[PDB]
Design a protein around this ligand. Structure first.
Ligand SMILES: Nc1ncnc2c1ncn2[C@@H]1O[C@H](COP(=O)(O)OP(=O)(O)O)[C@@H](O)[C@H]1O
Ligand SMILES: [Mg+2]
Ligand SMILES: [Mg+2]
Length: 224
């Protein structure tokens, strides 16, 4: 069944918003979908336990009715690097558990999207990063680019390292994190030339609750 890992040029660039658009597009295409945020930090308390906002968005945007824990097995309250808070709270992050969770979703979904945490090299332990897990799973990678000054360098750095890891950069998504500025078209042209993967689409600046906006329309899944 189809599976994609979604990474970004940094934290706070639109990975979650773009992942929701991707999931909406896949449901529209007739797939049985599931979003997966194996590791999450920066989460709020509820009577059921901690809930992360990205995991909730992926859950809501999945075509299947999924239990929270199946979407997000590892939830940390403090918004810091996963390895730091995992070591502090004595709750190790295990590659095998992350992988089992992906398999569990595949029991029911035929199209699974996995959202990473932070950027490509976010540490999970003092000796293991998210990039290590993606490499183990041999997942095709989708790069989310928040269109802003500095994004060309970050997109190029991320694409080069993914390629060096022997992984496939399946595509990229442009996300308009701020209102339109002067060199938007020039930036889009530059990124299109430099990133060695198809541009899947562009999400416009959507000030109010973009995670639940109808954004599937901005993604062309036939390019993926
Ligand atoms: N296209 C968009 N339009 C306007 N707001 C955006 C857009 N994309 C992201 N946001 C806002 O920017 C912040 C970071 O987006 P998010 O998808 O959570 O980033 P990441 O998952 O990369 O950390 C959030 O507050 C989100 O609501
Ligand atoms: Mg975030
Ligand atoms: Mg996110």
């Amino acid at each position: 069944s189809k599976r994609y890992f979604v990474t970004g040029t940094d934290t706070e660039v639109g990975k979650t918003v773009a992942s929701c658009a991707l999931l909406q597009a896949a449901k529209a295409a007739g797939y049985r979908t599931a979003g997966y945020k194996p590791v999450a930090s920066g989460s709020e308390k509820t009577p059921e336990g901690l809930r992360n906002s990205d995991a909730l968005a992926l859950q809501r945007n999945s075509s299947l009715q999924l239990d929270y824990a199946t979407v997000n097995p590892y939830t940390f309250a403090e918004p810091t690097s996963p390895h730091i808070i995992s070591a502090q709270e004595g709750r190790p992050i295990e590659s095998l558990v992350m992988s089992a969770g992906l398999r569990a979703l595949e029991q029911q979904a035929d199209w699974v999207l996995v959202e990473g945490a932070g950027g490509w090299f976010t540490p999970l332990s003092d000796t293991f990063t998210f990039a290590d897990w993606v490499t183990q799973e041999q997942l095709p990678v989708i790069l989310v680019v928040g269109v802003k000054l500095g994004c060309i360098n970050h997109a190029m750095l991320t694409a080069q390292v993914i390629q060096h890891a022997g992984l496939t950069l399946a595509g990229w998504v442009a996300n308009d994190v701020t209102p339109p500025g002067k060199r938007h078209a020039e930036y889009m042209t530059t990124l299109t030339r430099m990133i060695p993967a198809p541009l899947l689409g562009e999400i416009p600046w959507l000030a109010e609750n973009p995670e639940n906006a109808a954004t599937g329309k901005y993604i062309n899944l036939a390019l993926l």
